[PDB]
Design a protein around this nucleic acid. Sequence first.
DNA 1: GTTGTGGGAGCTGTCACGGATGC
DNA 2: GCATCCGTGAGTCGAGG
RNA 3: CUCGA
Lengths: 93, 1092, 426, 293, 94
Amino acid sequence: QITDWQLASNAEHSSTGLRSAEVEALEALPDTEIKEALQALPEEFRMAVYYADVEGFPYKEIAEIMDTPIGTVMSRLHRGRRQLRGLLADVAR
Amino acid sequence: SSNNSVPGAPNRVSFAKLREPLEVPGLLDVQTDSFEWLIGSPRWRESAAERGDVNPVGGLEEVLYELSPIEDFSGSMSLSFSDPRFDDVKAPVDECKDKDMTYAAPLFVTAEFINNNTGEIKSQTVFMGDFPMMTEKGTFIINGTERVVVSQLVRSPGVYFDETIDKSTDKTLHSVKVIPSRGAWLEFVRIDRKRRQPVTVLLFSEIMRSTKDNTVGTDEALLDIYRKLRPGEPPTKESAQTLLENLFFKEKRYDLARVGRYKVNKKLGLHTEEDVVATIEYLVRLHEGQTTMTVPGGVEVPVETDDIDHFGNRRLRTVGELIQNQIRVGMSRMERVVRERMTTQDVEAITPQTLINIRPVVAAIKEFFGTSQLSQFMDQNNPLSGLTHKRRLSALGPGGLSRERAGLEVRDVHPSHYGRMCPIETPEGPNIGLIGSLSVYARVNPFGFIETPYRKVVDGVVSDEIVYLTADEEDRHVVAQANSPIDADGRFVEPRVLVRRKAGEVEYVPSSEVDYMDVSPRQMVSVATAMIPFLEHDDANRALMGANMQRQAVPLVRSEAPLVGTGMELRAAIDAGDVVVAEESGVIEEVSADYITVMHDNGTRRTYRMRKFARSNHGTCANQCPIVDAGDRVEAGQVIADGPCTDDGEMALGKNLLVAIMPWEGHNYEDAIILSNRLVEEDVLTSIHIEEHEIDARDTKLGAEEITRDIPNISDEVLADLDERGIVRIGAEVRDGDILVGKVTPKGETELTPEERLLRAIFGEKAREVRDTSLKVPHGESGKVIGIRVFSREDEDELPAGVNELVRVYVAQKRKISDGDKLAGRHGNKGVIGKILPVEDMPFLADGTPVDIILNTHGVPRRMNIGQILETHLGWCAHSGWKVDAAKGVPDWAARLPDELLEAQPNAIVSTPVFDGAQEAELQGLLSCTLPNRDGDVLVDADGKAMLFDGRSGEPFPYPVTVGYMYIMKLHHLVDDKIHARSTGPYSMITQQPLGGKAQFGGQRFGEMECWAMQAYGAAYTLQELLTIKSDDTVGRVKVYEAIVKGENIPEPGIPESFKVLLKELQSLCLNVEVLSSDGAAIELRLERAAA
Amino acid sequence: EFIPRPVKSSFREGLTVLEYFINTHGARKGLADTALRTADSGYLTRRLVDVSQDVIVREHDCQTERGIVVELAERAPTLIRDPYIETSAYARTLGTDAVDEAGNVIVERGQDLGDPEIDALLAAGITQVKVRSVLTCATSTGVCATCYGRSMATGKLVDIGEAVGIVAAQSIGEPGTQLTGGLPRVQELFEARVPRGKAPIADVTGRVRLEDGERFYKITIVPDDGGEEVVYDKISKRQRLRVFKHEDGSERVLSDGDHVEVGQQLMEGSADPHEVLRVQGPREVQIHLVREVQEVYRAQGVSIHDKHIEVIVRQMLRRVTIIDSGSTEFLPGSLIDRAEFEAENAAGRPVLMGITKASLATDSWLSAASFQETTRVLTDAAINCRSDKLNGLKENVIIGKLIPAGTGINRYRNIAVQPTEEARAA
Amino acid sequence: LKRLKVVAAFQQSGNSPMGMVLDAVPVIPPELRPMVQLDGGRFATSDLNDLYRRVINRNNRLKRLIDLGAPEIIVNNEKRMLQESVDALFDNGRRGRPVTGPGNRPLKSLSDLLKGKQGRFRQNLLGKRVDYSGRSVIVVGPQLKLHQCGLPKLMALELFKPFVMKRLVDLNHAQNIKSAKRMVERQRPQVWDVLEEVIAEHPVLLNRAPTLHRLGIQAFEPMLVEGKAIQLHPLVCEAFNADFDGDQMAVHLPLSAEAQAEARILMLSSNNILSPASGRPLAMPRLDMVTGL
Amino acid sequence: VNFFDELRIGLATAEDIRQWSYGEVKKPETINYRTLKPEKDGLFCEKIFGPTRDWECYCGKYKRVRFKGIICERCGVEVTRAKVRRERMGHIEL
DNA sequence: GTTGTGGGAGCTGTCACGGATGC
DNA sequence: GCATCCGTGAGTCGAGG
RNA sequence: CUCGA
Ligand SMILES: [Mg+2]
Ligand SMILES: [Zn+2]
Ligand SMILES: [Zn+2]
């Protein structure tokens, strides 16, 4: 049997450590800072920054799911990234 | 009147009344002399010339002679090894400890190769490997850790007869067993797990004439062995002959012991086949029962069953012999390839170096020192720990018996242990009876038998000629006792004397019948046990506990020798090897907190470096301080500096405390202990504890970790104590949770949270994407950073594969005595501290002197250890000093022993040896003439009691209390180490249950018996919760945490993951298990919240 | 053994060298002996837990009129106190009204039989009583509260959800490490092993005939009913003869020609409980086993209430062995539960079986697999395509369901609670 | 009768006896036979993996032999070796000499995972390790009430950590919940007050091993104590067989409402004065008390 | 929901053993010593047992939660939570 | 592609019991 | 007809390395 | 492996 010493000592060098119920449950909670920073932007440009940055869709699929042309999607992307970097630049640090 | 031999050793007055006719041998000789035999040093040469024959051979020389010569099957070539030589040592001891090396020396040998048909003789010096070396203190350094090789108890080779009783009619049935130095054995002729062997089907006799056997000639007994032990092959006439000739006559396969051959020839005849004939005659004439036996050519052997635990038939293999056997294994594994290469290659072109592969010998030595059960992490809580550890004898391990195949008769004190293995010092737990410690004066002999010294007796005259006898030799004589009345000139005064005979029984024999006499009482004791004052007044349970607990005292910042001790503290401290000792008499030329230089008389300079705040294997603090001043003239052997638990050269494991024996408000109920807060304010029980945190940056799948001070989103203030590297700064005070060495570990992109994904996208973050794997300080720990060591792969620092960097932070902490800590006296009287009272409400004497420790009365009488009470009385005597009134003569009570004990100054150092020293009458006498305090007030009356005030109310306690001075040790069991709690932590990847152990921030185990208890209460929901949402429900537990944080009721519990795992294991066993609904098929087991 | 030379010193005078030496023998031997005794006690407690943990209270009263008679006194012209009223009479519930001959009804049936009740019964001259025990309890699954009586902890009547089985296993195992003829005998009994020294017993009333020989004891009973004469094999002289042949006769050692009743021990020693089962009946095997076990714990200063040992003994007799299947599918010579055998009804005779065997023969293959001999249990379960109802409390523990005991009972776990109207108002 | 029991089971079960012979072996998920690397680059694996590796190697060798049409004796040897290796994988040691790894350690076969005190059943199903639990050495507290016990501050802070975080966010000591966690971890002085509030009337279970009878686990109301040691009421010592020569005890925090209720009502020290085995009183003056009186 | 009614055993037929399996292991290789990556068709193969990292396939062309349950064609490794590695059995054909 | 001579470490100081197996 | 040979039990919870 | 209750 691999020991708890060995398991923890391995987690000491792994990509993800042995996580706690506390860590999980708190991860499930919303990050108020970034949630507030997102709620500021117009829900259209923010829906775009979501479909483009969080989910990583291709811009063509973003235009599809948005029912809008590609130019509008990418312009909302630029404007929203600029805005949120404005509000989240001091927050990011 | 003790310690006169050791120069500068303080004057500890001794109550003893017997002259010591023999000093303690080298308490480490058991290890040193063994290793010096293994190596063949000039020390061992002289020691064998003084007490041995003219032809000595060391362990390695013997291995080489046995191995030589490596010969070709055709006898065409021959290789011969000789002259084992050592170079100097590779690196010093402290260097090896630092670098995690193995203190060793290169081994060289002369290898002579001969081709019988070319005459070519090419001699060569071949190198065998880095042979690990024994230090001055008797240990080894392997991988930078210090280790001890514990001597092992095993049955010496020879033949042994026993008498069982058959289940038929309780008939007396004899049996025999032959244990060889090497090879297989046999019994009666059953051989090698093949019973149903008639003794007469392989060759006045009562049953030998009755053998039943139906055969004639030599081919029947030759074929029956091949048909009864070599199966899986037809019955042949040549293969059986070959096996029979290579079984016992062949010396390569069957290794006839040297000790074994000596024992057997002593059992049958002065000068194989002769042995087997004698053994058959022995079994026959033992089934009869005759006293002696006459064998062809041999005579004078008593027909008797042999005892398997007797120390004349039970030997121990010291470190030298264990190493020798491992070396023999490596050497045979090498000889194999040596012959296997002699075959293939051409002659006259093969040099000793070409056909000698040392890899197996190196691997053998390495495996021995790294995996053997007899190479143990050195117990070094304090000097006494290590001293006893080296002198220890255990019966478990490879070659001995099994911890489970060892019954109760193995663990029983045999009468032959007298003076060889102490009967008190042994563990209380499972290993009880299996691990003993060598007696003080005992000494191992060339054959592995433990000998002990006795004074020779000539015509009822105790001489000064000492002689060392083994268990056998001793049994054959009559040994007087040490406390036997003797007049000057060595003459027994009483008409007869009490003595011990071979039967392990005592007798009262006329003086002219005595052969030898004990060298001194306590000859049967071990070092630890010999340090318990008033041992004879303590029951063996509490005395065993006292020895074991002395071996657990933690070194204190300042050490104070016991006010009342045995005579052993000095010699124990010195032999232990934790004090600096002047190797050569000279004059102190310079002294510093760092080193001590002595200028010998012949102009030589010697200097000693003081171990300063060294961490020991168990966290105790090894810290030496010099006790010499510049210009002091020091003699050889004088103690130069005190070690961890030493004071002016004496073992000081604890402190002298003012004790009052009386129940105090229940706070010392049921073995608890009450301490005066002085012991905190004045650091009387304060100790230093040094831990070593370690962390390495290595190569991962997603890249390579990096030790960096730049850690993700950490407050600049939190790193305030980190240097530029990310390593904490020396002298920084670290609380639990602080960073010690910053480290980041490459994190994958799939692991980035949605929050982190967006953060790195919008602000155009880089592609580092690391995780904070920095080394933080664990719970319940704090202290100043003593030290920092660091090893870089960049530099020429050797590390394992894929390990770039490695840093070690050494953190020290000062532990004050606290509630929960475990104290104990030398008499097995242990207890945890229940409460530490303010000095003001501690009961105090007439002069306001508040007691230091309150020991509950209810604990003394049933434990049968009044030794502590006698010690308290004598300790108060020593703390106050005394003057026996000599005017008009010396009172009768003080007439017998007292010589320079008639008076003594306050704080006098006295020793009461065991089985000698302080007598009850003399104790009471001293108690009568206590000196008074400053104001001429006698505070402790002639009973050893004194009035005391209640420091709380002010009123005096109605009755006199026994107050005195007792030696109390701080045992290494402290709350700071044992407190532990957990709300939630890491789980096991296999069972998905919380990890176990404080070091891993584990959870407590709710065991099967605990679930029984819970059920008995009917606490269904508590049991379910304990077993589902606190252990295994991987979603239930996160739900529970989320619900507690948000003030919501605890959810309903799910399914233990361990059950799913059980199902999976069953399935992997080809068992089709299935969970079913009320009326249904098998149930199966196996986003919106995030977007919100 | 003992050394012919004693320790003449007191630990105050200080022991001489050799006295201390010899005393270490005893000290260390005792330490190791406790080391082993703790493990033996532990294994016995574990087997008890396993064989008994499925025994919970489920009804308030089975209303049965069965019970056991407990001696409350013996009379000598003043009455003695019954030797162990503390463990067999106290804390019971009275089965039949106990009235003193020519007296009022001193105690009513269904009472607690506490200290005042026992004292009143004793003052009135009640020399004995008949109480309800789990041995004679009539409930099908487990035991009824009233047959069990007072809960030793709570002092009141046991509640309907108690796990009296585990509490009995504990009450019996906790004092195990005090047994220094001992714990071995307790195990020999609970496992129902044919005793080492087997003391045969009379198979039927009649007249006895002894026959002496050189270490040969030959007994023969001529039955009073005229049936064939029962011949018992020769016994070595090591077994002295029992000391009751008193049927209006010699109240002393067994002599040839004495009248022997059916259940009379013939020679000193211990008797095979299976023999008494087949000769005197199951309710007699229960009494004998409880008393024999209690003997050991009594010879060591351990007051274990009889009801715990009865809770254990009950689970040794719950099955019967089928001689002839008859009209049923039950294989002969197979151990079948008594209710599973009564409902289906079939030559079913009572059978005694040890706690280990009784446990390994349970209806929950999961329980068996987790108790002992995992390999064999699992193989047989796979072959016989067994199905575990998941009804034992150990099973639920394994699967993470509320154990069916205490607060896990159905009536308790599904309670509905709403505030009354009068309180909801204010 | 014996040889009939098994045949009748096979008949009535619908389990074709053919199962007893296998043409395909099942392989357990890797997570249940994990692999890791320790300090030193070396790797550690479960015995299972090694037994599976031997089985698979011998199976591939048998395939390669069958293809090479080798002597019947060679292929028979390979088949016997395959059978032996599968027997090891299943119940190693049961037949022949057990398969040994380095140091001659018999590898833990698949059957070993279910058997023994440290097998699956007894070690991981009938009892496990739990959260919200702690341990520490016990010392007599005479000033205690029979229904009380003393918990070291740090212990209680760790056990109720989520409760204290909740009450730290209720009050405005902490901005958010992450900050409440960080605060409780730094031991900021705000927590202590809050702690004594959360602990109000919240029972905890104390256990000392060995647990011989149920009184070996008893419920107490906890009060904060100075030090790193658990304070235990003296009267209960009898029940626990606990003396203060250095033993320790474990603490468990009931979370659910039913759990707290079972602790208050069922397992409350005050409610368990009497020996469940004899009815005699255990929580009774024992030595000092006795002499005093 | 922890409200099952019964639990049953029975000898597994090779049909059951193969229905369970997600793929047959063929090689003794376990992981690539250099890249610390599971050798394919080995006792740790991700093709049959599961993916080591959440939503990451073997070769890497697919690594995102966007396409859950996708079965990569280059290396044939389903893109799902690695939890299945504790519940996906393999098999060996004798 | 392998072509001169060729049996290994391991218990190995446990006990008490019950029931296939095997001659 | 049974005598041996084997295979199963043999306390719990804690700490290091 | 040693040690604690
Ligand atoms: Mg204790
Ligand atoms: Zn009933
Ligand atoms: Zn892919």
